[PDB]
Each structure stands twice: as structure tokens, then as C-alpha cells.
């Protein structure tokens, strides 16, 4: 396992991750 | 007016258990999904409250003490009690709190009263159109100097004798915050004959009071002259403390759950 | 943009790679605000626009206590002939809540209207009204001439002239000259009674019962604006939601406690609070030996203005 979208209202901000998850099956 | 009822005497104080009794919503604020701690005059969970009765040769109306707070429950059919009355002294030399409901609106009056030894509400003829609705008034001879009135939003509520197990449930919170009152009530029916039923209740808020005196005793206003008895009807009488409810919400708001920790 | 990764980095050259040189944040458009429900208050109409009033002497105070005042029939309406305000202009007498305020409703002549001032002395200064030296109130005055005034005299008010000895300010003396003066309309402007009402101001400790000002503009939805209705102050988006508010619960919360939306204390609709936009400003650009060219990246979210 929105609790993002609440935080992110309070100015804490949640960088998204350079490596996707399309791209993490592909290289397992 | 001056003089008590012929049933008038003293009945034996007996005690029952409120389940989930206590609990109401604390203010204004809205959450839903959410888990919610706060702390107030509450109820306490499992606790003792004092159990109350009237009949047709048997009427009790003690004064108990409104000072740490009180918790109403009412399990009635044809809702005979209409209300209570607030007072330090209970006499004219003070202000003191007026509460009457006619099952249409509630008369709230702060003025000063000269109350009677046995106040009553008249009520008779009830062959064509009796309504339930009271005819003379015997609580106070005179008022003057009033220092607050107001008139709540009408509302309906079946005032129709019934036979059999209790139906009507009436739920009261009176609380004084910081000199001012705040009003909670709550009805829904239920099938009770005597004790109180397994389940969950949230009480919403009716009437905020800016009254501002201060009042260490209560009395019960029944029925709604030494000849004329009471009807069959029951109430209850809790006492508030400063417990710590987490109350559950759903996705509608409503409180489903509430948990108060000192037992277990 | 360049120039602002040398600022960043506190260097002349760059050296290839995405840095975070600023942040940016989008400024509110106007301000909305809401008050409950104006309409149908409790006028002023019971001491002003009644029938028969008392004499001078007779004066009944009304308490005014528990309500909303409003303030600006009196000035705007110009149906009064003149009033004398003191300590504060008719205009910010809206503006202020007070605590208690009394209503003095009398009837003077055309002559006497000079006569009510704080700290001076007359007939019916000295003999039956008089106001205090400390007295910041705020009186109006209109014409009964074409109500009160009756042939050879009206019998209620009956101007009692004599008295042994001067009233105190602020006292009613009703013990039962007498020998009416004429009140018929034929008399000149002097002559003929005015209707009097003195407003009465206490300001205590004590919460004011009394309510300010009442003010309401348009509401504006899906854009950044400062947004007050009664309760709370703050600047965000304001979106209407499917959420189902009690009629006794007003403000909502977010799982951290912070409030998500507001219900309209006029009408009935319930509108979520979002925080305007904002984040952080990245720049894209290569070495300083390479180009001068760069690249903004607004983190997080989408470009509406373009």
C-alpha cells in the first residue's frame, strides 16, 4: 500500500522518481 | 402550585449502565474517513446512571446538582416531560433558566421567577382535539426583570398515548462552557422495556445559549392540585466528566464509533 | 534564466545539468467574501417610524441588545432633516460593534434641537433632558410637524416648562404648569416639534452583542483568490464538491487537520478549499562553454497561461 494530495497542500512537495516503473520490469 | 401531589414521595434511586451513551459531535468542524481525538465533558463508557420512574400512585422530583455537568436520556411513548428548569437558588433572587417544549418549538426564557412548591403544566380535555398541549400554568406566579429570551425553529413529534413496551427516545447533552450553554439533542425510536438498549447514538446540536449566569442545581418539569398524578414515563440522569472520546467518521460525516479509554 | 543559475551557484560558468534555481508561486487574482443572510434583520423601525411617542420628561429607553444594526437608513436616505454625530462620522458607525445601545425616543420643538448637546443648559436641558459631558453618542432628528402637531396643542406630550430644580443627565422624572404649549402646524419652523432619538453606546469587556459591518461581492470559482466568508481568512482555489455538509457543521478538515473547504453562509452550497498552485522552478540548460540556451521546468504542474 488522497494522503499525497493532502501533503502536498501543507507545501510539502513529492518529487516523482527519474527511473519509471515501466522501465524497472524491462530491466529485471 | 403550593401544594405537593398526594403520589408525591421519595422513590428509591436506582441504577442502570449507558453503553455507548455520552457521545455527540464536539463543534461545527466537519471530517469524514478520519480518526479524531478530542477532549471535553463527557460521559463516561460502562458508567452509572441513576434510574427514574412515574406512574399513576408514585411521583419523585428531586433537585440534583447541574455543577460538573448532566446527561438527559428519556425513554417515553407519548413524550410527557417537556423539559427542566436551570437555577442557583431556585427563587427570585436570581436569574433562572426556562425550558419548555410544546413538541411544536422550545420557550427559552431567562428572567426572575417565584417558583411554586410543585410546579405543573395544565393539562386536560382530551375527548376532541387534545393536541397534548398545556392549558394553565402553575411553575411561577410572576416574572420580571428578564435578562435573555428566545424561540427556536418548530419542529413535529408524536405526542399520541401508546400501549405496550417504550417507543420514543429523546437524548439530551447540557453543558456550561465558559459561562455559555450549549444545547444537544437527539430522537429516534426504539423497543425498550426497562434498562437501557445495546447500540451506538451521536447527538447533534440544537440551541447555542449566550446566557452567561450560573446555575448549581436542576428540577424536573412533570407532569405536564394536590389530586392530579403523573402519567407512566421515564427519564434518566447523568453526570459529564472530562473524558477524551476518538470518535470514527464515515464518508457522510456521521460518527459511527466513538472510544473513550479508562476501562480497558 | 542563465543568469539566474549563476546567482543560484554563486559562479560565472555552468556546468551542465538541471538545478533548481527559484521557486514559483501564483499570486491571488481578487478577494471574495460572503456574510449570512442580510435580509429580514431587526430594524430600527419600532423607535423611528411609530406611531405616538412619549413627552420629553416621558422618555422610554428600548435596549438593543442580540441583533444587527444597520446604520445607514439614517444618512443615506436624506429623509432626516439634520442629526449631530459625535466622536465618530455617520459612516463608521456601521463599522463598529458595540456592546449595548439604548434608544431614547422624544419629541422637541423646532428651537430646542440646538438645545441637546453634551454639557449645555436650556428649557428642556436643565428641566427635563440633559446629556452628560462624557457622552459620545450619536443623535438624529426628523420632523413630526405633520403627525404629532394638533390644534390649540396636542394633549400627550404636553411640554411641561416648570420644574423647582435641574435634572441630573440621563434622567427621567414622570411625578405628575400644565398649561400645554401649542403645537398647531400654524406656528413657523421654530415652533413646530421635531422627532428626536438619541442612540445611546457602551463598549465593555463583554463580547458585543451588537454586529458590524455587512458587505457581500460575486463569487468566483476554479481561479487563486483571497476567499473570507465570517470565519477564516486565506487565499486558494475554490471548487464546488459533491460533499454533504450537516446544516450545523460549517468548516471541514483534510486528514492534517487543515480545512478543505467552506460552506456559504448565505446560500446553500459547499466548495472545496484548494492551495493555489506553486513549486519549484528548474533550469535546463547546458555547459557555459556549450550554448546559452535554457530550459524552465515547472514542477508539478500544468502551464494554463501560455
Given at each position: 500500500?488522497?494522503?499525497?494530495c ?11 522518481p ?5 522501465m524497472?520490469?524491462?530491466?529485471t | ?19 455507548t451513551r455520552?457521545?455527540?459531535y464536539?463543534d461545527?468542524?466537519?471530517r469524514?474517513s ?10 463516561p ?25 448532566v446527561?438527559?436520556?428519556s425513554?417515553?411513548?407519548?413524550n ?12 427570585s433572587?436570581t436569574?433562572?433558566?426556562?425550558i419548555?417544549?410544546?413538541?411544536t418549538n ?6 426572575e ?6 410546579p405543573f403544566?395544565?393539562?386536560?380535555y382530551?375527548?376532541?382535539?387534545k ?7 402553575r411553575?411561577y ?12 425553529q ?29 444545547i ?25 445559549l ?18 392530579w ?25 456521521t ?6 479509554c479508562?476501562?480497558? | ?13 555552468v556546468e551542465?545539468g538541471?538545478?533548481?534555481?527559484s ?5 491571488p487574482?481578487?478577494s471574495?467574501?460572503?456574510?449570512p ?36 437608513v439614517?444618512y443615506?436616505?436624506?429623509?432626516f432633516?439634520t ?9 463608521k ?12 425616543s422624544?419629541?422637541?420643538?423646532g428651537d ?13 436641558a436643565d428641566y427635563?433632558?440633559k ?20 390644534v ?6 404636553l ?12 434622567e ?24 428626536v ?9 463583554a463580547?458585543?452583542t451588537?454586529?458590524?459591518?455587512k458587505?457581500?461581492?460575486n463569487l468566483?470559482?476554479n481561479k ?15 471548487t ?12 471541514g ?23 493555489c ?8 540548460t ?12 515547472y514542477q508539478?504542474?500544468?502551464?494554463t497561461?501560455?
Amino acid at each position: 500500500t488522497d494522503l499525497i494530495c493532502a501533503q502536498k497542500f501543507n507545501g510539502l512537495t513529492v518529487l516523482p522518481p527519474l527511473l519509471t516503473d515501466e522501465m524497472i520490469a524491462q530491466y529485471t | 402550585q403550593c401544594v405537593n401531589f398526594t403520589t408525591r414521595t421519595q422513590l428509591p434511586p436506582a441504577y442502570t449502565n449507558s453503553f455507548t451513551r455520552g457521545v455527540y459531535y464536539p463543534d461545527k468542524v466537519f471530517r469524514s474517513s478520519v480518526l479524531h481525538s478530542t477532549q471535553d465533558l463527557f460521559l463516561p463508557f460502562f458508567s452509572n446512571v441513576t434510574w427514574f420512574h412515574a406512574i399513576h400512585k408514585r411521583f419523585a422530583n428531586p433537585v440534583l446538582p447541574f455543577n460538573d455537568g448532566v446527561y438527559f436520556a428519556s425513554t417515553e411513548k407519548s413524550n410527557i416531560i417537556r423539559g427542566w428548569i436551570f437555577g442557583t437558588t431556585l427563587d427570585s433572587k436570581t436569574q433562572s433558566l426556562l425550558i419548555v417544549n410544546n413538541a411544536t418549538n422550545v420557550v427559552i426564557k431567562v428572567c426572575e421567577f417565584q417558583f411554586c412548591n410543585d410546579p405543573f403544566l395544565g393539562v386536560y380535555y382530551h375527548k376532541n382535539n387534545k393536541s397534548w398541549m398545556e392549558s394553565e400554568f402553575r411553575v411561577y406566579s410572576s416574572a420580571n426583570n428578564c435578562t435573555f429570551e428566545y424561540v427556536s425553529q418548530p419542529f413535529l413529534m408524536d405526542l399520541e398515548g401508546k400501549q405496550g413496551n417504550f417507543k420514543n427516545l429523546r437524548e439530551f447533552v447540557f453543558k456550561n462552557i465558559d459561562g455559555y450553554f450549549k444545547i444537544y439533542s437527539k430522537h429516534t425510536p426504539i423497543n425498550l422495556v426497562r434498562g437501557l438498549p445495546q447500540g451506538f447514538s451521536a447527538l447533534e446540536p440544537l440551541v447555542d445559549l449566550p446566557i452567561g449566569i450560573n446555575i448549581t442545581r436542576f428540577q424536573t418539569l412533570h407532569i405536564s392540585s394536590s389530586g392530579w398524578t403523573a402519567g407512566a414515563a421515564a427519564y434518566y440522569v447523568g453526570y459529564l466528566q472530562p473524558r477524551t472520546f476518538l470518535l470514527k467518521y464515515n464518508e457522510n460525516g456521521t460518527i459511527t464509533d466513538a472510544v473513550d479509554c479508562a476501562l480497558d | 534564466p542563465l543568469s539566474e543559475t549563476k546567482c543560484t551557484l554563486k559562479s560565472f560558468t555552468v556546468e551542465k545539468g538541471i538545478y533548481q534555481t527559484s521557486n514559483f508561486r501564483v499570486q491571488p487574482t481578487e478577494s471574495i467574501v460572503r456574510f449570512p443572510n442580510i435580509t429580514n434583520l431587526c430594524p430600527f423601525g419600532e423607535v423611528f417610524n411609530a406611531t405616538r411617542f412619549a413627552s420629553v420628561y416621558a422618555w422610554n429607553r428600548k435596549r438593543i441588545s442580540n441583533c444587527v444594526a444597520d446604520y445607514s437608513v439614517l444618512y443615506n436616505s436624506a429623509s432626516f432633516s439634520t442629526f449631530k454625530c459625535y466622536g465618530v462620522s455617520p459612516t463608521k458607525l456601521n463599522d463598529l460593534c458595540f456592546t449595548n445601545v439604548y434608544a431614547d425616543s422624544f419629541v422637541i420643538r423646532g428651537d430646542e434641537v440646538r438645545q441637546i448637546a453634551p454639557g449645555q443648559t436650556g428649557n428642556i436641558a436643565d428641566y427635563n433632558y440633559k446629556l452628560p459631558d462624557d457622552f459620545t453618542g450619536c443623535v438624529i432628528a426628523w420632523n413630526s410637524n405633520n403627525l404629532d402637531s394638533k390644534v390649540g396643542g396636542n394633549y400627550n406630550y404636553l411640554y411641561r416648562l416648570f420644574r423647582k430644580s435641574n435634572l441630573k443627565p440621563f434622567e427621567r422624572d414622570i411625578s405628575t404648569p400644565l398649561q400645554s404649549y401649542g403645537f398647531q402646524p400654524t406656528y413657523g419652523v421654530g415652533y413646530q416639534p421635531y422627532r428626536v432619538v438619541v442612540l445611546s453606546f457602551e463598549l465593555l469587556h463583554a463580547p458585543a452583542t451588537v454586529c458590524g459591518p455587512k458587505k457581500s461581492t460575486n463569487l468566483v470559482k476554479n481561479k487563486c483568490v483571497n476567499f473570507n466568508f465570517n470565519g477564516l481568512t486565506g487565499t486558494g482555489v475554490l471548487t464546488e464538491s459533491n460533499k454533504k455538509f450537516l446544516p450545523f457543521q460549517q468548516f471541514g478538515r483534510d486528514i492534517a487537520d487543515t480545512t478543505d473547504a467552506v460552506r456559504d453562509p448565505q446560500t446553500l452550497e459547499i466548495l472545496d478549499i484548494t492551495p493555489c498552485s506553486f513549486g519549484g522552478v528548474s533550469v535546463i540548460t547546458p555547459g557555459t562553454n556549450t550554448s546559452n540556451q535554457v530550459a524552465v521546468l515547472y514542477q508539478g504542474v500544468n502551464c494554463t497561461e501560455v
